[PDB]
């Protein structure tokens, strides 16, 4: 779990396959499936399937059209 | 005469009669005052609103919590709260009932001193008593050995008890509870364009957290899944008809309990706090304390929290020990149930703080006849 | 309406003619539910046209001016103003209040005054606000028949409530504070 | 190659080359369209006027602000403004120069995503980076420790930094800024009979607010002076030759910054927000934060606002601490100067987000290499 926490937050698995080969065996020893080379999956807010423009209390004092 | 049990928690107030199975009145511990200037004469407006009444009209009020991190900051508001609890929900006369109270461990002593003074002067109660919430929680579950993790709205504390003997030096306290989770969710919700800033909108975020949050068994595994598809997404309807949709915010908000560093606190997660508290007891009672974890309080109602706690403790404890986490379905009211049980025991009737005693000793008597 | 009746050769330029045109507007105009749809019908046939008798015996007939005149309430662009329509003004007026009272304010649209008396204006208001409002919310328009005198009736009520006789302004108070007292005592 | 810094604020857009002392181009962020009919043929009237040409001809246009409360709302209008900034105001090709963009803290994450995508697809910039405006304000001050209060046209926010270490949990954001003050001044000017309702007449109110308003040291004493005599009354000449005179409105309009309840907002004034943001930090850095208050933004240029800030904070902080407010004369352009410094540092050349790095991870990359 600690290795995955560094990967997602800091970026330990940025190279995602061309690491120093010292960090490789340590990760390979921790998780043997070898799935860390894929990279940490990230959520993209560009698409917005559930985009919900919401006028709350503050946003309702100042708008256009 | 009939005894009264009043659990004045940070978020909600539980009240009722001793010997009952459930509290009779449960209302939020909020006092609201108008923020706009009135224009229509004849209806009449009160200067303040208390409890459910302040919740209904929250669109024109500012709601102030009289209790913060378990310590009563505003005393006039708490006086009004007790007035309400005594005359508009239970419909009782305080002078004719012995009332019981609860207090979080390791709190300032001025808090309980003022509580005792207020109840013996403003309301003239014939008898009173202040108990530690964890002890009542242990009474409610019908056990005399185990470690209690009571996590309410303001305070999350651990109190290990063995064979009716507590170990005060092992008691932990952490000011990380439901209100901080609500604040963290209010901060995180801005990542999706939803902005809640007003005190009325704080309550809405609280309802969202109550109805849509859960604790993930594997945090990194859960985050990956929500980033891969839209399975975990759910939509909530705002009071004005608009709809919002929250994704990984569902399990990020409660994760502050296990990773306090999200909100800038240096303390350890509640699992590590429980382990540290167990490890500070004697070596001969750790086997029993491992196998009698009792959770109670509102913050322990997130679905799946029991499994995550069991997994973390097992990861911390030695292999040969057996870890059992006890989560009764009525744990939200465990403190009040325990208080009702304690007030109905015959042996306890000799432990009340009578008015006579208070008069002779003074508000200082709360530090002797109470733990 | 004065500027638009010139399109049929009718000219009104003096104040008495102003009152006459105002009377025509009171007696013949109405608010069309779909301005674009109603404009097609008027240009297609002559069912919408009516007749009015001028004070000196001449007879005038007006067509699409019946519902183009009151449309300026919804599209102030007709008289050159940049401001938005009354429906969108009401919508904005609600979005500037606190989120917990929007539900109640949708369900209590009260309308009053003579300009509100046009036939069908309540239905057009309801349709426009429903178009602007969220789908779940219920839009209800309250249009009492005597709304031409709602302000006076409310004044009559407020001047007769017992709890009001302490909110007066008296000459003795006037002499001490001067004309500035009105902002301090009244809203 | 030379870098560009583009501080696309809510009210004005600042642009220039890195290493330069002042922005080369400053123009209002307005996109305008005609609201009449063009009866003269042969002029070939265009569709949209952007920038100064919109202000000059505003008598026949409707003016629309694409950025509001620091959040871009009309992306086509923003695209037009960026196109104008790159081509007609700087006379440079965006495809050959690195660019730096600024953003307010606590914005929705989708806001910077679309900025990154537009820069990397429509303009094909070689590299780009997004920084928080508050941090860049500290770079221009030549300081590495202090709390910044940035207040522009849309957003007023606080960011505490100690020894180059930011504390995200103490960041404050308040949507109360210059546009709100202009609207409140419009609403108050109807008391003297002056009426302003069109967008073109909004800009005149902005000009009179800039040229006549000042922050009062003591509000109540200032009101009495205004009502007693005519000393504070000043005259302004409208563009048509008509003259207006305003009285206490000179210092009532900026008072909203300290009393948000004037415009119906519930949050506290800027002074209390600044004090609260410091008090959320560790107690061992509060002395430096009191000693290094830095202010920036247009809404800070009111005469005598720094003295009011000092008086207000010193009344809240303990008596032993020293409050030093820093208000450099060029603080209206602090953010751009800080950006120009940052893009010019050799050690910053490795923090750019390149096109080769963009496509690899998609627009999501902006949430990792930036803050
Ligand atoms: N089903 C639920 N899911 C998540 N949180 C809950 C749920 N029910 C209650 N809570 C939380 O519990 C808190 C109050 O519970 P409680 O322990 O009664 O507080 P207190 O002990 O102060 O009275 C609330 O702040 C709420 O956030
Ligand atoms: N039946 C009607 N249909 C349409 N318009 C009307 C009608 N009656 C009155 N009006 C309009 O209402 C306007 C003023 O009415 P009223 O509500 O008395 O104004 P005020 O509120 O200023 O007293 C008049 O100019 C007239 O054009
Ligand atoms: N001398 C001044 N006095 C008062 N207000 C000013 C002055 N100069 C600029 N402003 C205000 O500053 C606001 C925008 O300034 P600026 O900080 O550049 O905004 P942004 O940071 O969004 O570019 C304008 O709305 C204007 O009202
Ligand atoms: Mg409790
Ligand atoms: Mg700016």
PDB file of N, CA, C and O in Angstrom, chain C residues 77 80-83 96 183, chain D residues 35 61-63 197-199:
ATOM      1  N   UNK C  77     -36.228  44.926 -25.544  1.00  0.00           N
ATOM      2  CA  UNK C  77     -35.486  45.325 -26.730  1.00  0.00           C
ATOM      3  C   UNK C  77     -36.357  46.053 -27.741  1.00  0.00           C
ATOM      4  O   UNK C  77     -35.817  46.704 -28.640  1.00  0.00           O
ATOM      5  N   UNK C  80     -35.840  49.637 -27.264  1.00  0.00           N
ATOM      6  CA  UNK C  80     -34.434  49.978 -27.267  1.00  0.00           C
ATOM      7  C   UNK C  80     -33.706  49.815 -25.955  1.00  0.00           C
ATOM      8  O   UNK C  80     -32.533  50.194 -25.872  1.00  0.00           O
ATOM      9  N   UNK C  81     -34.347  49.263 -24.933  1.00  0.00           N
ATOM     10  CA  UNK C  81     -33.703  49.089 -23.641  1.00  0.00           C
ATOM     11  C   UNK C  81     -32.883  47.807 -23.610  1.00  0.00           C
ATOM     12  O   UNK C  81     -33.275  46.779 -24.166  1.00  0.00           O
ATOM     13  N   UNK C  82     -31.730  47.882 -22.945  1.00  0.00           N
ATOM     14  CA  UNK C  82     -30.828  46.747 -22.806  1.00  0.00           C
ATOM     15  C   UNK C  82     -31.246  45.785 -21.704  1.00  0.00           C
ATOM     16  O   UNK C  82     -30.745  44.657 -21.668  1.00  0.00           O
ATOM     17  N   UNK C  83     -32.147  46.191 -20.819  1.00  0.00           N
ATOM     18  CA  UNK C  83     -32.537  45.346 -19.705  1.00  0.00           C
ATOM     19  C   UNK C  83     -33.294  44.119 -20.199  1.00  0.00           C
ATOM     20  O   UNK C  83     -33.778  44.067 -21.331  1.00  0.00           O
ATOM     21  N   UNK C  96     -31.086  35.410  -6.351  1.00  0.00           N
ATOM     22  CA  UNK C  96     -30.288  36.187  -5.414  1.00  0.00           C
ATOM     23  C   UNK C  96     -30.659  35.938  -3.957  1.00  0.00           C
ATOM     24  O   UNK C  96     -30.067  36.566  -3.073  1.00  0.00           O
ATOM     25  N   UNK C 183     -36.261  58.094   6.718  1.00  0.00           N
ATOM     26  CA  UNK C 183     -35.423  56.943   6.404  1.00  0.00           C
ATOM     27  C   UNK C 183     -35.148  56.095   7.636  1.00  0.00           C
ATOM     28  O   UNK C 183     -34.951  54.881   7.518  1.00  0.00           O
TER      29      UNK C 183
ATOM     30  N   UNK D  35     -25.958  46.174 -30.365  1.00  0.00           N
ATOM     31  CA  UNK D  35     -27.348  45.971 -29.976  1.00  0.00           C
ATOM     32  C   UNK D  35     -28.312  46.841 -30.771  1.00  0.00           C
ATOM     33  O   UNK D  35     -29.463  47.008 -30.357  1.00  0.00           O
ATOM     34  N   UNK D  61     -22.818  49.087 -28.053  1.00  0.00           N
ATOM     35  CA  UNK D  61     -22.498  47.697 -27.786  1.00  0.00           C
ATOM     36  C   UNK D  61     -23.106  47.254 -26.464  1.00  0.00           C
ATOM     37  O   UNK D  61     -23.474  48.070 -25.617  1.00  0.00           O
ATOM     38  N   UNK D  62     -23.216  45.942 -26.304  1.00  0.00           N
ATOM     39  CA  UNK D  62     -23.458  45.336 -25.006  1.00  0.00           C
ATOM     40  C   UNK D  62     -22.173  44.649 -24.560  1.00  0.00           C
ATOM     41  O   UNK D  62     -21.579  43.873 -25.313  1.00  0.00           O
ATOM     42  N   UNK D  63     -21.718  44.981 -23.359  1.00  0.00           N
ATOM     43  CA  UNK D  63     -20.423  44.534 -22.867  1.00  0.00           C
ATOM     44  C   UNK D  63     -20.614  43.306 -21.994  1.00  0.00           C
ATOM     45  O   UNK D  63     -21.486  43.288 -21.121  1.00  0.00           O
ATOM     46  N   UNK D 197     -28.088  51.738 -15.554  1.00  0.00           N
ATOM     47  CA  UNK D 197     -28.586  50.379 -15.741  1.00  0.00           C
ATOM     48  C   UNK D 197     -27.914  49.632 -16.882  1.00  0.00           C
ATOM     49  O   UNK D 197     -27.874  48.389 -16.857  1.00  0.00           O
ATOM     50  N   UNK D 198     -27.361  50.296 -17.888  1.00  0.00           N
ATOM     51  CA  UNK D 198     -26.797  49.594 -19.027  1.00  0.00           C
ATOM     52  C   UNK D 198     -25.354  49.182 -18.750  1.00  0.00           C
ATOM     53  O   UNK D 198     -24.703  49.675 -17.828  1.00  0.00           O
ATOM     54  N   UNK D 199     -24.851  48.259 -19.574  1.00  0.00           N
ATOM     55  CA  UNK D 199     -23.475  47.805 -19.414  1.00  0.00           C
ATOM     56  C   UNK D 199     -22.490  48.934 -19.684  1.00  0.00           C
ATOM     57  O   UNK D 199     -21.460  49.043 -19.011  1.00  0.00           O
TER      58      UNK D 199
END
